[PDB]
Swiss-Prot record:
It is linked to Osteopetrosis, autosomal recessive 3: A rare genetic disease characterized by abnormally dense bone, due to defective resorption of immature bone. Osteopetrosis occurs in two forms: a severe autosomal recessive form occurring in utero, infancy, or childhood, and a benign autosomal dominant form occurring in adolescence or adulthood. Recessive osteopetrosis commonly manifests in early infancy with macrocephaly, feeding difficulties, evolving blindness and deafness, bone marrow failure, severe anemia, and hepatosplenomegaly. Residues 1-257 form the Alpha-carbonic anhydrase domain. Substrate binds at residues 196-197. Changing residue 60 to H: Reduced proton transfer. Changing residue 119 to K/R: Strongly reduced CO(2) hydrase and p-nitrophenyl acetate esterase activities. Zn(2+) binds at residues 92, 94, 117. It catalyses: hydrogencarbonate + H(+) = CO2 + H2O; urea = cyanamide + H2O. It comes from Homo sapiens (Human). This is Carbonic anhydrase 2. Optimum pH is 6-8. The lineage of its organism: Eukaryota, Metazoa, Chordata, Craniata, Vertebrata. CDD domains: alpha_CA_I_II_III_XIII. Changing residue 5 to H: Reduced proton transfer rate.
Length: 258
């Protein structure tokens, strides 16, 4: 079998195949707002998704993933704690089975209904594959999801979920603007971490937005209708595909806001 989120292959088994799962810079972590350090020396975050170019959306059996053309600097992330340019390559979602869970990062132990991960990689490394092998190769943008008013930017994804219900299924997803997935405020917390799924490489500079985005009940409901399984196998709803919080160790979490 493969790694996953089930009893016999979930986050608790990962360390056997990827020993780094027990490393010193593992993600996600809990964000204790009473001890996070405000650092007024962080250049403002710069999100430039003006010429963004999405390609397709896919169900790899772990989540839905929207792939982007990262051959050029069309949709990048700079500023904040980042040095250089980071190219957006993919966006996926971690969701729960209940509104009270689903996010990977937590704030004062509170879990959100879901967490969006916008994955970017350092252009000083040539490509994603080379980037994941560097302590500062990736820059992932995390956005918490909370039930409220429907998010138009997410409705685009919601409307195609039917076509990619099972593992391995993919659909064309061009003309998708990721700007519609952001909240109003760009305030964030940041700390050095890793990928949250195998190979769990400690190559990412985490940027987690303080302000979640709102999604309607109908939308969140549709985001839980996807399947972990491939067509024809016993149906396993793709819910609770999140890795719990990991030991922060001596890492310091910094806030961009007072
Ligand atoms: Co993720």
């Amino acid at each position: 079998h493969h790694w996953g989120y089930g009893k016999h292959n979930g986050p608790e088994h990962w360390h056997k195949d990827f020993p780094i799962a027990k490393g010193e810079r593992q993600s996600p972590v809990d964000i204790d707002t009473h001890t996070a350090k405000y650092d007024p020396s962080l250049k403002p975050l710069s999100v430039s998704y003006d010429q963004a170019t999405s390609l397709r959306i896919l169900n790899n059996g772990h989540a839905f993933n929207v792939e982007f053309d990262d051959s050029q600097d069309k949709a990048v992330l700079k500023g904040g704690p980042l040095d250089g340019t980071y190219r957006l390559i993919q966006i996926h979602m971690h969701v729960g089975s209940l509104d009270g869970q689903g996010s990977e990062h937590t704030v004062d132990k509170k879990k959100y209904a879901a967490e969006l991960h916008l994955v970017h990689w350092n252009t000083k490394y040539g490509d994603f594959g080379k980037a994941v092998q560097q302590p500062d190769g990736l820059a992932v943008l995390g956005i918490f999801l909370k039930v409220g008013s429907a998010k138009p930017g997410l409705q685009k994804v919601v409307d195609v979920l039917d076509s990619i219900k099972t593992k391995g299924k993919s659909a064309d997803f061009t003309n998708f603007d990721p700007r519609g997935l952001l909240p109003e405020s760009l305030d964030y917390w940041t700390y050095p971490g890793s990928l949250t799924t195998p190979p769990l490489l400690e190559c990412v500079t985490w940027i987690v937005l303080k302000e979640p985005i709102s999604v309607s009940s109908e939308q969140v409901l549709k985001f839980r209708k996807l399947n972990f399984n491939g067509e024809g196998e016993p149906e396993e709803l793709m819910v609770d595909n999140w890795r719990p919080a990991q030991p922060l160790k001596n890492r310091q979490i910094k806030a961009s806001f007072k």
